[PDB]
Coordinates of C-alpha atoms and ligand atoms in Angstrom, one line a residue:
X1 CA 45.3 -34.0 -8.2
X2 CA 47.5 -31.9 -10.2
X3 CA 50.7 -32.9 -12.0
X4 CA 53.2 -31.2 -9.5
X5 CA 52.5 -31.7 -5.9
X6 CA 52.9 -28.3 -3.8
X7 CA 52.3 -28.0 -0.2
X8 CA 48.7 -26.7 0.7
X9 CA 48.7 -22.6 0.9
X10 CA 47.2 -20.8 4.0
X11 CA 47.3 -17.4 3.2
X12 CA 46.4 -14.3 5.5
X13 CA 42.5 -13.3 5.8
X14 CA 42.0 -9.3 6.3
X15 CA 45.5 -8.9 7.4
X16 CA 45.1 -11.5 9.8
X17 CA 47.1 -15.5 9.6
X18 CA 45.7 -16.7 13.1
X19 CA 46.6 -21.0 12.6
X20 CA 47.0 -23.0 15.0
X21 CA 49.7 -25.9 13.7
X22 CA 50.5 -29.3 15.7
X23 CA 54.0 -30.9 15.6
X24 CA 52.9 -34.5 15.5
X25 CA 53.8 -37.7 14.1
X26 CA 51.9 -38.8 10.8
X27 CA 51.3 -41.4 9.0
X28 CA 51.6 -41.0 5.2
X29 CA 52.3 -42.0 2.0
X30 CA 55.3 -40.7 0.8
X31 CA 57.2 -41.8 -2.1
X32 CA 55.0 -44.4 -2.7
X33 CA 55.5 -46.1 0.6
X34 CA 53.6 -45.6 4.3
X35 CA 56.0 -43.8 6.7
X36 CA 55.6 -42.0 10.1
X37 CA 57.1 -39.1 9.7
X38 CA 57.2 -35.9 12.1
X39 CA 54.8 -33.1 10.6
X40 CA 53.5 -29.5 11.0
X41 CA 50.2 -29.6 9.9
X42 CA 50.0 -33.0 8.9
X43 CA 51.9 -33.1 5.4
X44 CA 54.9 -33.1 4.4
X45 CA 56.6 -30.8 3.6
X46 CA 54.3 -28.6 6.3
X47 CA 52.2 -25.6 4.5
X48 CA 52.7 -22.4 2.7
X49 CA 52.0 -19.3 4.5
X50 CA 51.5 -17.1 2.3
X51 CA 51.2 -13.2 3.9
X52 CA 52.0 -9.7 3.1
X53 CA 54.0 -7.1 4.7
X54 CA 52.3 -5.4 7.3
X55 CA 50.3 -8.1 8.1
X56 CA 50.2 -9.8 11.6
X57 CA 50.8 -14.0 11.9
X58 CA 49.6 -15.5 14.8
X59 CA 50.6 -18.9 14.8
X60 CA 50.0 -20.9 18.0
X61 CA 52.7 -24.4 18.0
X62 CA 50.9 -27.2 19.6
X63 CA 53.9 -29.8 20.4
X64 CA 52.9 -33.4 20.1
X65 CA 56.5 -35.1 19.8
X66 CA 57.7 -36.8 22.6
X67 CA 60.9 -34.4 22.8
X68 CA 60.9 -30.1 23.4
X69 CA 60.8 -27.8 20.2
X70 CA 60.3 -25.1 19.4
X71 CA 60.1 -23.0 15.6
X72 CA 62.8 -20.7 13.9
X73 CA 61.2 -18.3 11.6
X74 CA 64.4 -18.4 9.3
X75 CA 65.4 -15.3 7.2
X76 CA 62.0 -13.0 9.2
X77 CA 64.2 -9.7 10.5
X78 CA 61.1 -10.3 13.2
X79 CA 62.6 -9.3 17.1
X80 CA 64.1 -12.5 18.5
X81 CA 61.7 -12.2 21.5
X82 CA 59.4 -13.5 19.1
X83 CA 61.8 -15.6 17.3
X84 CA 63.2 -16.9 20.0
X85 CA 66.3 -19.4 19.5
X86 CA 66.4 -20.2 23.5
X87 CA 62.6 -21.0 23.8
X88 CA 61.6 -25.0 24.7
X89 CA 58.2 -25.7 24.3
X90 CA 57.6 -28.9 26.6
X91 CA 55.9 -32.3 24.6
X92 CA 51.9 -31.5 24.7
X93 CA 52.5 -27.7 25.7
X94 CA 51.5 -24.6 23.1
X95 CA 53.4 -21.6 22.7
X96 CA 51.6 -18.6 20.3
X97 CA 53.8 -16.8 18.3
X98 CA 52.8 -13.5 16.9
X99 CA 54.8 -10.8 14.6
X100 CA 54.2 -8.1 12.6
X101 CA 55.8 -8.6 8.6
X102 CA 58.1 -5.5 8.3
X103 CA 56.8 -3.5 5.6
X104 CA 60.3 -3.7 3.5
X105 CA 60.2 -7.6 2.6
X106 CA 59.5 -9.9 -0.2
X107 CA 60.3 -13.4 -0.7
X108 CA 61.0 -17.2 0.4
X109 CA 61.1 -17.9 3.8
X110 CA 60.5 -21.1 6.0
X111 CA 59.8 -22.3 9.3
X112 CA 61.5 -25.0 11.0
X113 CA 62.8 -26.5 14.6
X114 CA 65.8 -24.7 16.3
X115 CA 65.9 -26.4 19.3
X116 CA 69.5 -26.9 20.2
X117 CA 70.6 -30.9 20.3
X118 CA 67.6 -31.7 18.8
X119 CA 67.7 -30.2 14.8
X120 CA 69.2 -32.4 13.0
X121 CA 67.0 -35.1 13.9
X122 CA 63.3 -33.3 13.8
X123 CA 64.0 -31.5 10.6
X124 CA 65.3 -34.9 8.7
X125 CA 62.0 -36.4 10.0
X126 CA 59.8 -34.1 8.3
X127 CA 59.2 -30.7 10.1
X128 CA 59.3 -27.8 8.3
X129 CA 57.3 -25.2 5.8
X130 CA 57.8 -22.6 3.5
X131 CA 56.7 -18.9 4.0
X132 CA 56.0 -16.6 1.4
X133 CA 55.7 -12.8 1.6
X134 CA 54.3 -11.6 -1.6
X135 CA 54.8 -8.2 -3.1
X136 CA 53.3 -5.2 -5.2
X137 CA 56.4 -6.3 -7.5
X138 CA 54.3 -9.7 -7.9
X139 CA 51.8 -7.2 -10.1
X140 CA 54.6 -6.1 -12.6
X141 CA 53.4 -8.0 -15.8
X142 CA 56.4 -9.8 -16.5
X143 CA 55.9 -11.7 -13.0
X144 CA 51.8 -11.8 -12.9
X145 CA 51.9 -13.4 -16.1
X146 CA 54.1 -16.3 -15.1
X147 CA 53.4 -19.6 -13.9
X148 CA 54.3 -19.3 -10.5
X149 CA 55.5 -22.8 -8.7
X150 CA 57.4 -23.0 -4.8
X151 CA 60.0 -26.1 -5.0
X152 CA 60.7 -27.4 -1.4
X153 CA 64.1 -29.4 -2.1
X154 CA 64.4 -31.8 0.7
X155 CA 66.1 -35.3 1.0
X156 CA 64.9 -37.9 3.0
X157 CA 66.1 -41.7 4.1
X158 CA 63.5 -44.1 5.1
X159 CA 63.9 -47.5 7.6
X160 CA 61.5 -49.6 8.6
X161 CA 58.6 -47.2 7.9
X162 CA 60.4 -44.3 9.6
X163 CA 63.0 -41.4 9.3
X164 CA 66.4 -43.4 9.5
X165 CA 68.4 -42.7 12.7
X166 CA 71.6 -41.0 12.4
X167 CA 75.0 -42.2 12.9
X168 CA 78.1 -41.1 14.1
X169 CA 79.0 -40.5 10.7
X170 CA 76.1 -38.4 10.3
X171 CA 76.8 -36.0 13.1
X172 CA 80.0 -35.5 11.0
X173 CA 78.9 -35.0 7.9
X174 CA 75.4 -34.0 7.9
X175 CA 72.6 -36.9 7.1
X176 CA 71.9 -36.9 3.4
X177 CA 69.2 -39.1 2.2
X178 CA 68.5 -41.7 -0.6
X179 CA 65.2 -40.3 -1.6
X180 CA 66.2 -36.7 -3.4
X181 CA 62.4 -35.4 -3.3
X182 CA 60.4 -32.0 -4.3
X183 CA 57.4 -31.1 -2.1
X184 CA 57.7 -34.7 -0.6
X185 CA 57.3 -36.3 -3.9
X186 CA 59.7 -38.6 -6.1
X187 CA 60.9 -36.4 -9.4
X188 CA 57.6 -35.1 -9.7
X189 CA 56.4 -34.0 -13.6
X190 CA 55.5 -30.4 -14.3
X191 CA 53.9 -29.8 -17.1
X192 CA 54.2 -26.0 -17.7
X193 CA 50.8 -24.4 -19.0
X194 CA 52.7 -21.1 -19.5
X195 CA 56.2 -20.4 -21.3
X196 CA 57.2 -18.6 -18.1
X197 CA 57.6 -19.9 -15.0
X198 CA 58.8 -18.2 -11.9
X199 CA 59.9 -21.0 -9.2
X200 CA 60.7 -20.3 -5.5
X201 CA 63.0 -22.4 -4.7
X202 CA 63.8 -23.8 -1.2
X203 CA 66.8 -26.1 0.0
X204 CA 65.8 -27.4 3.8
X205 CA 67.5 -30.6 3.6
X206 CA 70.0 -31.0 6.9
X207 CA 73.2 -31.1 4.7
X208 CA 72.5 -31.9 1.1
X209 CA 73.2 -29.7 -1.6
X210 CA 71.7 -29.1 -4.7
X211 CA 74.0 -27.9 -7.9
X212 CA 70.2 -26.9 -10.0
X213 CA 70.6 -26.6 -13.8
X214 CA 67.7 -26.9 -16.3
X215 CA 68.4 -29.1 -19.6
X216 CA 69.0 -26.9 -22.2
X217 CA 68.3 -23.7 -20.8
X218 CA 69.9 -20.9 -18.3
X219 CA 68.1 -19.7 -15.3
X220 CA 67.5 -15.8 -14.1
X221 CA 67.7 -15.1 -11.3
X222 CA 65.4 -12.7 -9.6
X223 CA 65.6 -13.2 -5.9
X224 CA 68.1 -14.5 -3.0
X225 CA 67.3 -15.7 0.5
X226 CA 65.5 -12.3 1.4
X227 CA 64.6 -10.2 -1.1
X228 CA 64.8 -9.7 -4.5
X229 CA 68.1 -9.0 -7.0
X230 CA 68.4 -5.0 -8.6
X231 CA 67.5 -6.8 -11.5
X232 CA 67.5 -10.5 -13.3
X233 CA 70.8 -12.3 -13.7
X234 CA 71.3 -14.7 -15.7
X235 CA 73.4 -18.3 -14.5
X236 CA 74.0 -21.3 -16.0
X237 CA 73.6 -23.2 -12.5
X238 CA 72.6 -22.2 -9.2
X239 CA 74.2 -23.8 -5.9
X240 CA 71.5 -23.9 -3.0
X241 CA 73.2 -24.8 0.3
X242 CA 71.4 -25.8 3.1
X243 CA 68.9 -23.0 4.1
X244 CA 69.3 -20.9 1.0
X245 CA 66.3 -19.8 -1.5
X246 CA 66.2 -18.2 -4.6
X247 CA 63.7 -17.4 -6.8
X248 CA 64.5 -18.1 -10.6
X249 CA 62.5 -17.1 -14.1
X250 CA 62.4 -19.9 -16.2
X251 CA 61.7 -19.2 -20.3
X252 CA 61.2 -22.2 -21.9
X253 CA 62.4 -22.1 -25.5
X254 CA 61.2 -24.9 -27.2
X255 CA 58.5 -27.7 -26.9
X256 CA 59.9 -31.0 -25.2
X257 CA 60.9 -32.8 -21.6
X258 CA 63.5 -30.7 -19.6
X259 CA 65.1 -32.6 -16.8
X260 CA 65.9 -30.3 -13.5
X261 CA 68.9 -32.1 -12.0
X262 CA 70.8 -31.7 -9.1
X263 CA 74.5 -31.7 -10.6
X264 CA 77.5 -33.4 -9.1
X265 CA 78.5 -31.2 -6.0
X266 CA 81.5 -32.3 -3.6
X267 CA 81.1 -30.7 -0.1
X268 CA 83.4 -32.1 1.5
X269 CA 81.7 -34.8 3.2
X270 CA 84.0 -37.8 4.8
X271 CA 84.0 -41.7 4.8
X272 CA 86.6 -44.0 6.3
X273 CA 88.6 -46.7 4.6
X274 CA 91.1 -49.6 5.8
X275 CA 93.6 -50.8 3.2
X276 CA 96.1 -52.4 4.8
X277 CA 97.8 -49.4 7.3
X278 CA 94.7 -47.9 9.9
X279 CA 91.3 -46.6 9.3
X280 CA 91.6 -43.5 7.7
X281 CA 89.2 -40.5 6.8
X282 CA 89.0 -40.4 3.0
X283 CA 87.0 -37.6 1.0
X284 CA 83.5 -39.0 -0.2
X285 CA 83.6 -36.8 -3.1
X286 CA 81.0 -35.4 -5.7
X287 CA 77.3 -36.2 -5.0
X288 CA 75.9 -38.7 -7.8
X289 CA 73.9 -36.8 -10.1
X290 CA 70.0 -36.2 -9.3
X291 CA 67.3 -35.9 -11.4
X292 CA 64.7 -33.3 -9.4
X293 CA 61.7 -33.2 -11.7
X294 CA 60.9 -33.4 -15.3
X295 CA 59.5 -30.3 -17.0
X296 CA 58.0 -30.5 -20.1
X297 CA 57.2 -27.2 -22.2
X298 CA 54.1 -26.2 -23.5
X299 CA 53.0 -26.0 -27.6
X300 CA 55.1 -23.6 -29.1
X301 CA 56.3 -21.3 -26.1
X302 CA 56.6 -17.7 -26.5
X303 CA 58.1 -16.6 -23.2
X304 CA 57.2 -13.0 -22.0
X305 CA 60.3 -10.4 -21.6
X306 CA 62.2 -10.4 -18.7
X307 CA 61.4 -7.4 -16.0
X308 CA 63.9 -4.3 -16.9
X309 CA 64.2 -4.0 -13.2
X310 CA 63.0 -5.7 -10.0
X311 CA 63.7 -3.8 -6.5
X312 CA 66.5 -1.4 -5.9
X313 CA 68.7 -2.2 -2.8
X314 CA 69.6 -0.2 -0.5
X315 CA 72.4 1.8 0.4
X316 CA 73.7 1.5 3.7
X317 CA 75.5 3.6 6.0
X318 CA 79.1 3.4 6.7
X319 CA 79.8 0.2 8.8
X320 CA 81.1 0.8 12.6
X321 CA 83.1 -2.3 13.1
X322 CA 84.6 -5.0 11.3
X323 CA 84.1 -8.8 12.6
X324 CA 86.2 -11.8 12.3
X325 CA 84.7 -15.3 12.9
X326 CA 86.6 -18.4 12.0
X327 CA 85.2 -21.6 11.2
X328 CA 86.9 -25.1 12.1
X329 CA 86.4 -28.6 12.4
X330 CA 87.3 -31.5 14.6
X331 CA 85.9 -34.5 12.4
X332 CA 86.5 -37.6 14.2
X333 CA 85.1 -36.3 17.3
X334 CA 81.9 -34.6 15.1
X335 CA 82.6 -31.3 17.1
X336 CA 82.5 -27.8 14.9
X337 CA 84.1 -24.6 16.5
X338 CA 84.0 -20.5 16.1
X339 CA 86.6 -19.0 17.0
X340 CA 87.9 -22.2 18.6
X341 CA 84.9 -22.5 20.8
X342 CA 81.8 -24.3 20.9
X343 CA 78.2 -23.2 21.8
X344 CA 77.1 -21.8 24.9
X345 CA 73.9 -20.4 25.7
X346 CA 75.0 -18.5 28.3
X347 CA 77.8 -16.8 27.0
X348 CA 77.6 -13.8 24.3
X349 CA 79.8 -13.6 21.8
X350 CA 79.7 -10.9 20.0
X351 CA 77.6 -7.6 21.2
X352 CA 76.6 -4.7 18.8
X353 CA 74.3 -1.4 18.4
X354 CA 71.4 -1.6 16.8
X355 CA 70.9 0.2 13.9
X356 CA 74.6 -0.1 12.9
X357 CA 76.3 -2.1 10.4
X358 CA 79.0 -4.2 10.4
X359 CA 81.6 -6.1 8.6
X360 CA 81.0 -10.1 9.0
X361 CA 84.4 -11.9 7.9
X362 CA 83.5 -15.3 7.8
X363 CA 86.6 -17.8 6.9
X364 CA 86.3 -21.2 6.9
X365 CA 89.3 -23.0 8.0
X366 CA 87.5 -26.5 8.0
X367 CA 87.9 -29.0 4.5
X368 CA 83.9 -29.3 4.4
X369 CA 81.2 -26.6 3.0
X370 CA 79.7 -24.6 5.7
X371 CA 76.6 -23.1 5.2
X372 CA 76.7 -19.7 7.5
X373 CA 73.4 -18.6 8.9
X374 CA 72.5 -15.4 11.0
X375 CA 69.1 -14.8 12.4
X376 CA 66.7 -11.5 12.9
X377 CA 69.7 -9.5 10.9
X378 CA 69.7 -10.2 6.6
X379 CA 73.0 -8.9 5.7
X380 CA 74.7 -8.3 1.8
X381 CA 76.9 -10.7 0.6
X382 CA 80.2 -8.5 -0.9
X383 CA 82.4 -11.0 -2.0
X384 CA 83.5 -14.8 -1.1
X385 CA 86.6 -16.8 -1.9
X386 CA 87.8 -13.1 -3.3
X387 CA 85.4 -12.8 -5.9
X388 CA 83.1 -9.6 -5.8
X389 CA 79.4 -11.0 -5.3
X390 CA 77.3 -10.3 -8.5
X391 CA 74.6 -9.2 -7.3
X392 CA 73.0 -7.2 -4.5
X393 CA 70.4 -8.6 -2.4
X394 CA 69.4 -9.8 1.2
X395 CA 70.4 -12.7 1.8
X396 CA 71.3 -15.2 5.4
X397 CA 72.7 -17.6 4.5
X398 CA 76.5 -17.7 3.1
X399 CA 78.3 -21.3 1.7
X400 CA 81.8 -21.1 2.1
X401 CA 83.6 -23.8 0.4
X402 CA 87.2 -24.8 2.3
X403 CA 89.3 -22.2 2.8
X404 CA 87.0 -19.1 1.7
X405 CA 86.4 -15.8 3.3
X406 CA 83.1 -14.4 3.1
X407 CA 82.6 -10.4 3.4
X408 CA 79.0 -9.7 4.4
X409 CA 77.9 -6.1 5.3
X410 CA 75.3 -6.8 8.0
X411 CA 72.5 -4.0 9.3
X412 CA 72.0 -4.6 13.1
X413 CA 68.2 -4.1 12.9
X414 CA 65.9 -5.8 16.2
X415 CA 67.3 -5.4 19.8
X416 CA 67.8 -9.0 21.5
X417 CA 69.7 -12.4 22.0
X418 CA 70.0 -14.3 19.2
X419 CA 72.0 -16.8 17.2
X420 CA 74.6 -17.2 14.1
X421 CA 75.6 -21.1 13.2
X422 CA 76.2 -23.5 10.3
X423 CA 73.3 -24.5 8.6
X424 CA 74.4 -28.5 8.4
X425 CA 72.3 -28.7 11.1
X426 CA 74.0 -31.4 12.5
X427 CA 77.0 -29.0 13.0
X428 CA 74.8 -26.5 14.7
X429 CA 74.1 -29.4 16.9
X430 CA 77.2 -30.4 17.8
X431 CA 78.5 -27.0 18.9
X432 CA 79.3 -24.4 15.4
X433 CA 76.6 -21.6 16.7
X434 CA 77.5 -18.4 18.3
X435 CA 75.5 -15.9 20.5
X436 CA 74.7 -12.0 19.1
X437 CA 73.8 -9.2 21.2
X438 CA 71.8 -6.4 20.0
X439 CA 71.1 -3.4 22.2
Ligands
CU1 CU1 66.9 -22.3 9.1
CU2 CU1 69.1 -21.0 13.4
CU3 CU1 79.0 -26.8 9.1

């Protein structure tokens, strides 16, 4: 087949994406090696839907695991009636989901189990896929023109021909994997037919990070979780925490191989050593490096200019209230707390008014990265750890390294119960989610 493996597309016909996906466990090669892993679709990573705004997605789950799930259409400001946080769908059951695409959207999205207890270990086995909204911005030259690629950055750890179990230490830390993939295969080779290339770029690993930097070459940014920048900024490296996208130009400057690595990141994550006194935790440190694929530039690339502007944001109305939620940790017993509590899905935490915005201080007391993720309502990121954010743009997911305060100025958009939690899924799992009323 081609050079860089990408999940299959499905894209919507007259307006309509009517699919019906199965949940199921799947034999495959991955890697170079048979596993069973747990897939929508039947691959892994599950496919790209690829709609437009206005159109409507029917997508009817049929659940062939031998445990409940359920889907969490992440970063879709869809009513959470629809996607619905609280909903088990029973093993061999069906549920239909079915949603407009607001009108105002663009970007990477992606689909995956939220099914509380139970995330950590069906997304490490395989279950999840990528949505794309495309735009009339897509048409702009300086985008048409490039080479367009979606990079699903996802970690995996294989025993005995299946996902590896977790451990304690897992539940703690997040389960990272040995097997650093893109689209399910082992540092794949793209070999770029145009001097432009516009990546999507998707981290749904449970808990690894990914520091990205090209060899020899700066990346610009165009667009965040939901939307696109006000215009292309230019970074040297680009942190993608659990649940975070972005979308990058890449302008290849010279013929040759580029590596994409994954760069030493420390999180935070946690081992235990015994050197004489009692077992103590001890930092794990820095990731090793990653290499994520190799790139290799055409003959003699002549990029194309970068777009003078991409979307303007919008201004939002004066906020109503100000939030404070604080993040902490109890380690040795793997439980995660906000506000000193743990999840309840009978108890709301926090009620506002639709069509309102608020101030979301997030601080994060705990000595790991938290990844903070809030469904149905995309909010702007204003600053974190005291540094003015530099760009404006949707985004909904927020890392906060130890000790960092995130301002976010969040729009209350669909009426509804839904959910706010770290994105180590394993810590959503073990009690760091909150509940949101909208009314
Ligand atoms: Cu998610
Ligand atoms: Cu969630
Ligand atoms: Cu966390």
């Amino acid at each position: 087949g081609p050079s860089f493996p990408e999940p299959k597309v499905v894209r919507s016909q007259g307006g309509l994406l009517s699919l019906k996906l199965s949940a199921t466990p799947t034999p495959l090669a991955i890697a170079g090696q048979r596993a069973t892993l747990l897939t929508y679709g039947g691959s892994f990573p599950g496919p790209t839907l690829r709609v437009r705004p206005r159109d409507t997605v029917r997508l009817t789950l049929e659940n062939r695991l031998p445990e409940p799930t359920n889907l969490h259409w992440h970063g879709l400001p869809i009513s959470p009636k629809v996607d619905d946080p609280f909903l088990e769908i029973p093993p061999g059951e069906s549920w239909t989901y079915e949603f407009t695409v607001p009108k105002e959207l663009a970007g990477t999205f992606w689909y995956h189990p939220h099914l509380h207890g139970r995330v950590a270990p069906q997304l490490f086995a395989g279950l999840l896929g990528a949505l794309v909204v495309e735009s009339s911005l897509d048409a702009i030259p300086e985008l048409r023109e490039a080479e367009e690629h979606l990079l699903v950055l996802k970690d995996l750890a294989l025993q005995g021909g299946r996902p590896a179990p977790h451990t304690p230490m897992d539940w703690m830390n997040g389960k990272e994997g040995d097997l650093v993939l893109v689209n399910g295969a082992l540092r794949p080779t793209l070999v770029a037919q145009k001097a432009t290339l516009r990546l999507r770029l998707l981290n749904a690993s449970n808990a690894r990070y990914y520091r990205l930097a090209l060899q020899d070459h700066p990346l610009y940014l165009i667009a965040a979780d939901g939307g696109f920048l006000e215009e292309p900024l230019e970074v040297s490296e680009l942190l993608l925490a659990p649940g975070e996208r972005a979308e990058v130009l890449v302008r290849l400057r010279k013929e040759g191989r580029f590596l994409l690595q994954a760069l030493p990141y420390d999180r935070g994550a946690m081992g235990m050593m015994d050197m004489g006194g009692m077992a103590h935790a001890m930092p794990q440190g820095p990731s090793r490096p990653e290499t994520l694929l190799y790139l290799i530039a055409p003959k003699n690339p002549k990029p194309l200019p970068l777009p003078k502007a991409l979307s303007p944001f919008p201004t939002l109305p004066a906020p109503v209230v100000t939030r404070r939620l604080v993040l902490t940790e109890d380690m040795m017993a793997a439980r995660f707390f906000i506000n000193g509590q743990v999840f309840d899905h009978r108890r709301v935490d926090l009620k506002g008014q639709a069509q309102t915005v608020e101030v979301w201080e997030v601080e994060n007391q705990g000595d790991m990265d938290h990844p903070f993720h809030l469904h149905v309502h995309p909010f702007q990121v204003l600053s974190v750890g005291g540094r003015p954010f530099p760009y404006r743009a949707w985004k909904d997911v927020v890392n906060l390294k130890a000790g960092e305060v995130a301002r976010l100025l969040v729009p209350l958009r669909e009426k509804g119960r839904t959910v706010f939690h770290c994105h180590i899924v394993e810590h959503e799992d073990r009690g760091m989610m909150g509940v949101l009323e909208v009314g």
